[PDB]
Design an enzyme around this catalytic site. Structure first.
Site, PDB file in Angstrom:
ATOM      1  N   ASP A 133       0.812  -1.209   0.000  1.00 18.68           N
ATOM      2  CA  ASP A 133       0.000   0.000   0.000  1.00 18.68           C
ATOM      3  C   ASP A 133       0.859   1.279   0.000  1.00 18.68           C
ATOM      4  O   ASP A 133       0.645   2.220   0.791  1.00 18.68           O
ATOM      5  CB  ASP A 133      -1.004   0.005   1.167  1.00 18.68           C
ATOM      6  CG  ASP A 133      -2.075   1.082   1.027  1.00 18.68           C
ATOM      7  OD1 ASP A 133      -2.288   1.623  -0.084  1.00 18.68           O
ATOM      8  OD2 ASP A 133      -2.707   1.409   2.052  1.00 18.68           O
ATOM      9  N   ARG A 137       0.347   8.930   1.728  1.00 19.88           N
ATOM     10  CA  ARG A 137      -0.325   8.828   3.017  1.00 19.88           C
ATOM     11  C   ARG A 137       0.385   7.828   3.937  1.00 19.88           C
ATOM     12  O   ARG A 137       0.151   7.850   5.147  1.00 19.88           O
ATOM     13  CB  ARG A 137      -1.795   8.422   2.866  1.00 19.88           C
ATOM     14  CG  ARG A 137      -1.980   7.083   2.186  1.00 19.88           C
ATOM     15  CD  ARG A 137      -3.425   6.575   2.159  1.00 19.88           C
ATOM     16  NE  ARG A 137      -3.461   5.366   1.344  1.00 19.88           N
ATOM     17  CZ  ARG A 137      -3.474   5.380   0.012  1.00 19.88           C
ATOM     18  NH1 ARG A 137      -3.492   6.528  -0.636  1.00 19.88           N
ATOM     19  NH2 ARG A 137      -3.466   4.257  -0.674  1.00 19.88           N
ATOM     20  N   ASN A 138       1.197   6.936   3.371  1.00 17.46           N
ATOM     21  CA  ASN A 138       1.945   5.955   4.169  1.00 17.46           C
ATOM     22  C   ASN A 138       3.432   6.284   4.250  1.00 17.46           C
ATOM     23  O   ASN A 138       4.260   5.393   4.438  1.00 17.46           O
ATOM     24  CB  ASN A 138       1.729   4.516   3.650  1.00 17.46           C
ATOM     25  CG  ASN A 138       0.357   3.977   4.010  1.00 17.46           C
ATOM     26  OD1 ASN A 138      -0.187   4.300   5.071  1.00 17.46           O
ATOM     27  ND2 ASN A 138      -0.194   3.147   3.162  1.00 17.46           N
ATOM     28  N   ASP A 151       4.304   1.707   7.823  1.00 18.82           N
ATOM     29  CA  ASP A 151       3.182   0.762   7.763  1.00 18.82           C
ATOM     30  C   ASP A 151       3.324  -0.273   6.656  1.00 18.82           C
ATOM     31  O   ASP A 151       2.335  -0.760   6.093  1.00 18.82           O
ATOM     32  CB  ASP A 151       1.852   1.510   7.695  1.00 18.82           C
ATOM     33  CG  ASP A 151       1.454   2.093   9.049  1.00 18.82           C
ATOM     34  OD1 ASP A 151       2.207   1.897  10.044  1.00 18.82           O
ATOM     35  OD2 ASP A 151       0.376   2.715   9.127  1.00 18.82           O
TER      36      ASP A 151
END
Ligand SMILES: NC(=O)c1nnc2ccccc2c1N
Length: 270
Positions: A133, A137-138, A151
């Site tokens: 992913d 945002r990560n 993450d």
């Protein structure tokens, strides 16, 4: 100590200082471990995570160590809710950081952010570990402006089906190659595709990919062979690099080692 494995942190060693934000697993706080050591404390919302599976994987993640990867320090287990204890990143999420126009970024800084992420991902690739992913945002940003990947692998433990099915309302359609959208074929090359979209997010100062399209429209666009186009701040050479991540045929996409070399070449030339 006595009742704790190497992957387990005693929550009693934590001092809570400030709230940092929220994510799909819930609230994240800034604290100190044993009075001295800065940590982020991810408080995992009840029912959000396949916890026994995650805890077994934490043992593996404990051994992933690279300067551009947000370090996992341990887990506070056998309590409700569980905590994930990680490296503290004072400047928070990359996406928010990019969107703050006060920073007035130079393109050299943007390329450095891409290089930071590419180094982390080359390390993960060398360990055959997929992020699954990858997106702005990560990624997180520390007090020195260094970007690190966070993450990694955690989507495998998310219980919300809206996130985990390519059909779901919360699936990362905009970061996914055609073979993921069409038949759920995840690989090193789906991380490569996502990395290209991340370079696009960085050079676009945090705009949403395919911002005028719905997820359904995006999937159609991509499956028909069409792509994002060049952010104004990306040079021709930088655009060539991100675009190379989006070959329709997965085997024609570069590795992270190759991308890293290409990024370094552009840094020397620009
Ligand atoms: N590791 C960290 O320091 C950190 N982790 N997760 C976040 C989520 C939302 C806002 C900020 C953070 C943050 N600073």
């Amino acid at each position: 100590g006595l009742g704790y494995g190497s992957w387990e942190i005693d929550p009693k060693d934590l001092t809570f200082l400030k709230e940092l934000g929220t994510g799909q697993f819930g609230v994240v706080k800034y604290g100190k471990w044993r009075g001295q050591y800065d940590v982020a404390i991810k408080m995992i919302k009840e029912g959000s995570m396949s916890e026994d599976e995650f805890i077994e994987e934490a043992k593996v993640m404990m051994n992933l160590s690279h300067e551009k990867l947000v370090q996992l320090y341990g887990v506070c287990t056998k309590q409700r809710p569980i905590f994930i204890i990680t490296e503290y990143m004072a400047n928070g999420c990359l996406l928010n950081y990019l969107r703050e126009m006060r920073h007035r970024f130079q393109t050299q800084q943007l390329l450095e952010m891409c290089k930071d992420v590419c180094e982390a991902m080359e390390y993960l690739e060398s360990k055959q570990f997929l992020h699954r992913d990858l997106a702005a945002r990560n990624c997180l940003v520390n007090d020195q402006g260094v970007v690190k990947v966070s993450d990694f692998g955690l989507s495998r433990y998310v219980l919300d089906d809206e996130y985990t099915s390519s059909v779901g309302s919360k699936f990362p359609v905009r970061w996914s190659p055609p073979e993921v959208l069409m038949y759920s074929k995840f690989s090193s090359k789906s991380d490569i595709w996502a990395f290209g979209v991340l370079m696009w997010e960085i050079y676009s100062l945090g705009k949403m990919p395919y911002e005028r399209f719905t997820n359904s429209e995006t999937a159609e666009h991509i499956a028909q062979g069409l792509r994002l186009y060049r952010p104004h701040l990306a040079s021709e050479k930088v655009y060539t690099i991100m675009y190379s991540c989006w070959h329709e045929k997965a085997d024609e996409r570069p590795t992270f080692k190759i991308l890293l070399s290409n990024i370094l070449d552009v840094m020397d030339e620009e």
